[PDB]
Amino acid sequence: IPWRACTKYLSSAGILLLSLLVFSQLLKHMVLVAIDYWLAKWTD
Amino acid sequence: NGCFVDALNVVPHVFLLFITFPILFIGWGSTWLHFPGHNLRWILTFILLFVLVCEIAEGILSDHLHLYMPAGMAFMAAITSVVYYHNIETSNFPKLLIALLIYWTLAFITKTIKFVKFYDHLRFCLTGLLVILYGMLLLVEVNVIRVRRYIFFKTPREVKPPEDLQDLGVRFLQPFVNLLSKGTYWWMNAFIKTAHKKPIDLRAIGKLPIAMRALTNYQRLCVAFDAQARKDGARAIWRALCHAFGRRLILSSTFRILADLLGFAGPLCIFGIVDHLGKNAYVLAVLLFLALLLQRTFLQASYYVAIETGINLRGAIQTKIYNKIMHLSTSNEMTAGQICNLVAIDTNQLMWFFFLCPNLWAMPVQIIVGVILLYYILGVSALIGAAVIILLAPVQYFVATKLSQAQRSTLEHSNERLKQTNEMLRGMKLLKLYAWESIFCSRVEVTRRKEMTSLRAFAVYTSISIFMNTAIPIAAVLITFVGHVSFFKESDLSPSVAFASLSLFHILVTPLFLLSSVVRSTVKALVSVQKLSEFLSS
Amino acid sequence: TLECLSRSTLLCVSALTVISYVTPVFLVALLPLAVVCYFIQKYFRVASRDLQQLDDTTQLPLLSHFAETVEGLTTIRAFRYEARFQQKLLEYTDSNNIASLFLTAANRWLEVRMEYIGACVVLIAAATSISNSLHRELSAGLVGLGLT
Amino acid sequence: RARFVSKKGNCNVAHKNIREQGRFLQDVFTTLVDLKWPHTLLIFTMSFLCSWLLFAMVWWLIAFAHGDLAPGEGTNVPCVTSIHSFSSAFLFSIEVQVTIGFGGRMVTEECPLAILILIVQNIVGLMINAIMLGCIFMKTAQAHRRAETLIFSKHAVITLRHGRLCFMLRVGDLRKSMIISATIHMQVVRKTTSPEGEVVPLHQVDIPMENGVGGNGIFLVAPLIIYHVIDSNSPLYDLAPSDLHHHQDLEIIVILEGVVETTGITTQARTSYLADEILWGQRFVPIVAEEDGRYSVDYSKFGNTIKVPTPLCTARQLDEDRSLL
Amino acid sequence: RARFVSKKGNCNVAHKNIREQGRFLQDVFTTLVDLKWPHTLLIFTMSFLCSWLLFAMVWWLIAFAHGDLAPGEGTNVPCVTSIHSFSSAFLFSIEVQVTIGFGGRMVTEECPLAILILIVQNIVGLMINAIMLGCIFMKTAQAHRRAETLIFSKHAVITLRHGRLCFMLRVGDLRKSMIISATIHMQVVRKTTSPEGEVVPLHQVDIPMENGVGGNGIFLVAPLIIYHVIDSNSPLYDLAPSDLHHHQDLEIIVILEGVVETTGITTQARTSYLADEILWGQRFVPIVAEEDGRYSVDYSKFGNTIKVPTPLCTARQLDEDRSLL
Ligand SMILES: COc1ccc(Cl)cc1C(=O)NCCc1ccc(S(=O)(=O)NC(=O)NC2CCCCC2)cc1
Ligand SMILES: Nc1ncnc2c1ncn2[C@@H]1O[C@H](COP(=O)(O)OP(=O)(O)OP(O)(O)=S)[C@@H](O)[C@H]1O
Ligand SMILES: Nc1ncnc2c1ncn2[C@@H]1O[C@H](COP(=O)(O)OP(=O)(O)OP(O)(O)=S)[C@@H](O)[C@H]1O
Fold it and tell me: Where does the sequence pass through the membrane (chains D, E)?
């Protein structure tokens, strides 16, 4: 299945929520890695 | 004369590795014959692989090439014995077996000499384990010749290789392959590669072996039901299924528990490595590699054996309740719908519960080993953390139940909507002949809003589930590490402790979710088997 | 399912970036193996989809058959045609089981092979971490994240 | 549908339930020597290196065991003089095995065990050399690359010759080398039911090759259309022209046997023609042409075919019409 | 009673009073090289060791005789330098015989007798090496393990086909390798008394193999029942169905000849069927079956047989009844 079906599916949502979802997911994963990255320096 | 005995041990591996190459290159340049002790032989060969890895670790710790060459030679010797037994299973011979037996005997002799010269004065345990494994393989070979016609009188009275899984076209050959591929599913390479090009269909698909049909499972189930009813119900049918499906289920369950043990074991060797470098680690790394691969392989074999037992059970009880459909009386519309739900939802519930059966036995030991292991790494504080994660498991269940309730309500509305559609898509010409269509579309949209309203609460519960899923892992580490160092004893938390706790937290979060679904599936299956018993006995 | 796919893909990318930042050279070793997964992807889907639909088909005439036996039960018990119909139902349940069995076999195949590669990557990561991050780099906070 | 023997000449019938009890012997060598030249060279060097390394290992071991490997002056003479490490041991092994005999390292008359290891080394080396020479010579007798080049036309035709229906099918040579006393065994298979209620799944019957006064053989220089005429006695005489194209299952096989010149072995070529392969009422294009001073054969028109206004009817009805006309 | 040729194909008739005067020659080698591979390897190493020990003994003797074996410094040069005991003598023998030439012990230009013993040693060694190589290569041409695997059904049946009595008997292949131009020589033996008062103890007569227009040969891919029809002209046409089972002595032998592909040699299979072996009025079970996409042959039903309601009568009386019906 091409990217066109998903493109139409997400464009029915609009530009309002697409970025609000994608950047929030990116930031959540960045926090989930950064907590352990800081714990690494916490250890010693 | 240590190096002398080392060379004396190196010799026989060279002998076998040199005899194997002509025959291996002849074979490299469709009937599967299996011999008694094949599975035992492959198990012992994998144990040999492990012990040879340990010997290589010893040789690295000691270093002197001639002092650790025997392990590297026996490695290729065992691999070539595997290739030999593959070439014998693909084409039987009374002479290649003797060629293996000679090598087994010579290796046993050399190991005995090593043991004696060591007793006259870590090596001890590995040498003893190798001796025992080679002796058991020798006994397997002796059993094979005792059963075969290698040196026995004129004719072997061969087995006439089984036509159960090798006769007229069959494609799903699970029971009839090498016990390594029975684990790693190597026989699927050909199927999947052919499937990439040509579209699969029932003509391109196989036919089920005699080991698993409607007739076979029905026969076993009716034999158990007969042996239980001749001694005369819900408990009766239950015990009948239990005694009928027997060994396969418990085999899957024990595969599963051993895999769970090794999975709990991984992070501890991680911890050991982290300790060693901050203050004997390559060995721990290769052991971690081996333990990971073995644990996951056993987990997967467990899954598959359970799934196959479940599919057997579904076929069996389906053909059984169809056999019952023939003798029922006409006095018993609603019963037809109840019958077809008894096959569409009740049987699927039964079979999926039989999927999840071994998980219900393997979950408690997993959480117990997890909590006891984390306690000895983090102390009293660990206990506190060990509570929080566990507290997510009942809560999850509660959440799930709410979902179900919501689902029910939503379904109701949905059904009604469909009705209000079926009219419009039939009186099409009537509808458009006077353009009353918008008037009905208003009503259809009125139903839709109610449907939307239900969906909000359902998705709120879904959001709460997804939120807890990744919130409890964070909260455990938060309230544990903050509550360990800056609260209780100010103990210096080495990186090993924290990272082992992290690993164990994930390895314990993964199974926790499954217990809730397991409990729901089990109670639903109990109700469905009560229903099946009420029906099957009318 | 969309939420789960997004979480999974981002967690995987994050884990790869972590084990790369911990040991730089390990990065250059992991891109080969990942390319392997690409070949494991195609061959899977073009079959996993196919088998899937086949399952659906073998589920549809089976259930329907059941219903046909229930309504016209008197006619079927009168004609004494019970044997042939039982034969048909054994045929249908076999056609259902072969599909629902090949599907689980293929899922096991993909699972085991992806797992073998996921163990190769941790082997190589630990083997690089024990030497690079201890002998030369002598930094202990690294190996923890990478191993975990 | 299923075919009897494939176009390439290989057999299609797969055998099931063979006793297989007798095939439990060691025919190891010949099958290895039949392999491809690269694979055969690989296995030959493999055998040689295997034996060499085995005896090098045992010689290093015996020199280590006697104590002669321990470097010491006096109180001994090494069983093999001037032996120091595993490298010189392997050099001695390759010096005594392949019979070059450098003689820098000398086996002495002090240790009879070295005498025994030498006396077994030499005989095993001679035996493996003899088998590896005989087998490669037996291989160099491979003329199979030149054989099986015989070609038949993809589809065979039927025509009307001398007032009778006839079968026309092209054969031919592809090299200068002839084939001596080539004979044609033309056969037809069909699922037949006897009048006694017996049904056979496949029935081979000989359809004759129509030559001069007699003879089952032919002479192949140029592409010669094999010429048979189906009569009321022939088994193929009963079929119909419109039912052969789609439904019927008739395989007409030809077996051309003959001994090649240079090697003297008797090879053959078997090919099948199905019901959907054969067609009706056509004529091949003349291949041979009077060239400058010779006969030129054009193989582009080998499988070419031209329309012929010939009547289309069944051979039984054609014979009845011949009785009427 | 006595059989003519056994089922396995070997001959049963024992020959008596052979002149045996000519069989007094030395055909020694070829018969030894035909033996089994273990026995042949044993005799080969035996010959080699025999020659080696013989010449080692003669060299020790000559070194002892010249006095060079007596350990002494000066006033001489040993015919073979650095020779001390029988062990070094045997080492020199194996060094010069199998042509390794270590050269630690050197034959010198002082004694022409050593030159003569060397010049005979080398030529006898070369001749024995040449024969022991040619013979093992001639052995590796053994494809007899693959031959003689042809199988016939244990008992043959008779039936009624096309209104005439017929003989049905199964043949077949057991390997992928075909057999080229296999012909059938079907014969029958019987103690016959001529009308001139002459009594023959055994009388071979050809009973035809009924194929197409002609031909003494067949084509073997699948098990093909050989189909013969006994007529008033056939020699077997006179017997009775009730007298064959117990009393009569009739041996029907078949001789299937044919050349194998890979080796090109012409092998054959001979088998007998007695009067007590053959039975009456039955039919074989169809072997070939339309498999998934091929033809499946089941060899379990190879010798299986089903009852057929066919009339039981003598072939002469059957022909008389055909004249009446
Ligand atoms: C989510 O994993 C788990 C992780 C951990 C544990 Cl302790 C248990 C499980 C688990 O799942 N419990 C075993 C029972 C089970 C059910 C489904 C699957 S499956 O993989 O999703 N599906 C298939 O294999 N085949 C399907 C089966 C249904 C017919 C169509 C083909 C695999 C296994
Ligand atoms: N010009 C040629 N020279 C030598 N051999 C040929 C030649 N043309 C065809 N052949 C071979 O002999 C057979 C004769 O069949 P054709 O007359 O070529 O009919 P066809 O339908 O064109 O078959 P093709 O060319 O293989 S698709 C073929 O199977 C070829 O393999
Ligand atoms: N399935 C088989 N595959 C290959 N060869 C066979 C098979 N069965 C029998 N043969 C051989 O071919 C001959 C055929 O005779 P059969 O049909 O087997 O009658 P028979 O009375 O069963 O003889 P047997 O099996 O030797 S006691 C036998 O002499 C066997 O040696």
Answer: 35-61, 112-140
* Contact D19 CB / ligand 3 (< 6 Å): yes
How was this structure obtained?
cryo-EM
CA distance D236 to D275: 12
Interface touch B200/C47, C-beta < 8 Å = yes
> Locate tokens 């039982």: which residue?
C86
Q: How many domains does chain D have?
A: 2
The answer to whether the beta carbons of residues B33 and B159 sit under 8 Å apart is: yes
Dihedrals phi, psi of D322, to nearest 5 degrees? -65, -35
- Using CA atoms, how far apart are residues C69 and D247, in angstroms rounded to an integer? 38
Query: Look-up: residue for tokens 């190991």?
Result: B111
CA atoms of B416 and E229, how far apart (whole Å):
82
SS3 for A2-27, per residue?
A: CHHHHHHHHHCCCHHHHHHHHHHHHH
Is the domain of D310 the same as that of D255? yes
**Do residues D188 and D316 share a domain?**
yes
B452 torsion bin: left (phi>0), alpha (psi -120 to 50), beta (else): alpha
> Exposed/middle/buried for B211, CB within 10 Å: 0-12, 13-18, 19+?
middle
Taking a C-beta distance cutoff of 8 angstroms, is the pair E255, E184 a contact? yes
> What's the rounded Cα separation, in Å, for the pair E71 and E83?
9
Q: Which of B15, B21, B26 is the closest to D28 by Cβ?
A: B26
Same domain, D132 and D151: no
Q: Are E288 and E203 in contact (CB under 8 A)?
A: no
Q: Which residues contact E204 (CB under 8 A, 6 or more apart)?
A: E187, E188, E189
**What is the Cα gyration radius of chain D?**
34
- The whole domain housing D198 covers 1-13+143-325
Residues with Cβ within 6 A of ligand 1?
B 303, 306-307, 355-356, 359, 362, 511, 514; C 100, 103-104, 107
List B451's β-bridge partners, or say none. Answer: none
Residues 239 to 278 of B: which have CB under 8 A from any C CB?
270, 273-274, 277-278
Burial category of B467 from C-beta neighbours within 10 Å (exposed 0-12, middle 13-18, buried 19 and up): exposed
Nearest to D66 by CA among D49, D78, D50, D57: D78
Verify that D108 and D175 share a domain, yes or no. no
Q: Does B472 touch chain A (CB under 8 A)?
A: no
- Taking alpha carbons only, the member of E120, E100, E134 closest to residue E51 is E120
The ligand placed nearest to the CA atom of residue D172 is: 2
Q: Could A43 and B470 be called an inter-chain contact, meaning their C-beta atoms sit closer than 8 Å?
A: no
Q: Which of E89, E123, E142 is the last residue of a domain?
A: E142
Q: Domain boundary at D124, D142, D160, which? A: D142
Chains within contact range of chain A (3+ C-beta pairs < 8 Å): B, C
Each as own residue / partner, the long-range contacts of residues B176-184 (CB below 8 Å, 24 or more positions apart, any chain) are: B176/B32, B176/B209, B177/B32, B178/B42, B178/B86, B178/B89, B179/B38, B179/B39, B179/B42, B179/B43, B180/B42, B182/B301, B183/B297, B183/B300, B183/B301, B183/C112, B184/B297, B184/C112, B184/C116
- For residues D198 and E299, what is the distance between their CA atoms, to the nearest angstrom? 19
Instruction: Find the discontinuities in chain C where C to next N exceeds 2.5 angstroms and give the residue preceding each.
Output: none
CA B419, CA B426: separation in Å to the nearest integer?
11
Regarding beta strands E251-260 and E266-273, do their DSSP bridges make them parallel or antiparallel, or are they unpaired?
antiparallel
CB A33 within 8 A of CB C14: yes
Burial of D103 (0-12, 13-18, 19+ CB in 10 A): middle
CATH code of E254's domain? 2.60.40.1400
Residues E31 and E106 in one domain: yes
Same domain, E50 and E167: no
E103 shares its domain with E21? yes
CA distance E89 to E83: 7
Residues E269, E217 within the same domain: yes
Q: What is the CATH number of the domain that holds D109?
A: 1.10.287.70
B172: nearest CB among C67, C98, C112: C98
